[PDB]
Amino acid sequence: LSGAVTALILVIASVIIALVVVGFAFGLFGAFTGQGTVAQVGTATLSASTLTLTVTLKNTGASTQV
Amino acid sequence: LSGAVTALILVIASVIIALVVVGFAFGLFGAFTGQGTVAQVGTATLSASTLTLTVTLKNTGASTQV
Numbered sequence: 646l647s648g649a650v651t652a653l654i655l656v657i658a659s660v661i662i663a664l665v666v667v668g669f670a671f672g673l674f675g676a677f678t679g680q681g682t683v684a685q686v687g688t689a690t691l692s693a694s695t696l697t698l699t700v701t702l703k704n705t706g707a708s709t710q711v
Numbered sequence: 712l713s714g715a716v717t718a719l720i721l722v723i724a725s726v727i728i729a730l731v732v733v734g735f736a737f738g739l740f741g742a743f744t745g746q747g748t749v750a751q752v753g754t755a756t757l758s759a760s761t762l763t764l765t766v767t768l769k770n771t772g773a774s775t776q777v
Contacts, residue, residue: 682727
C-alpha cells in the first residue's frame with residue numbers, strides 16, 4: 646500500500662518542481678528581453694578644451710547607467 | 712529545456728550587438744562627412760620683408776587649426 650502513496654507523493658512533488666522550473670524559464674525570457682539596448686544614432690561632439698562629450702543615444706530597454 | 716533558453720539569450724545578445732555595430736557605422740558616416748575640407752580659392756600673397764602670408768581659404772567642414 647505504501648508503493649502507491651510514494652508514487653503519488655513523488656508525482657505531485659515533480660509537478661510542482663517542473664512548474665517552478667518553467668516559470669523561472671519564462672521569467673528569464675521576459676528579463677533578458679527588456680534588459681536595455683543602448684546604441685548611437687548620430688555623431689558625437691567631443692569638446693577638447695573642456696573635454697565634454699555631447700552624444701545622442703538610443704536606449705530601448707531598461708534605464709541603465711554610464 | 713535549457714537549449715531554447717540559451718537560444719533566446721544568444722538571439723537577443725546578438726541583436727543588441729548588431730544594433731551597436733550598425734549605429735557605430737552610421738556614426739562613422741556622419742563623422743567622416745563633416746570632418747573639415749579646406750582648400751584655396753585664390754592666390755596668396757607672401758610679404759617677404761615681414762614674411763607674412765595672406766591667403767583666402769575655403770572650409771566647408773569643421774573648424775580646424777593651422
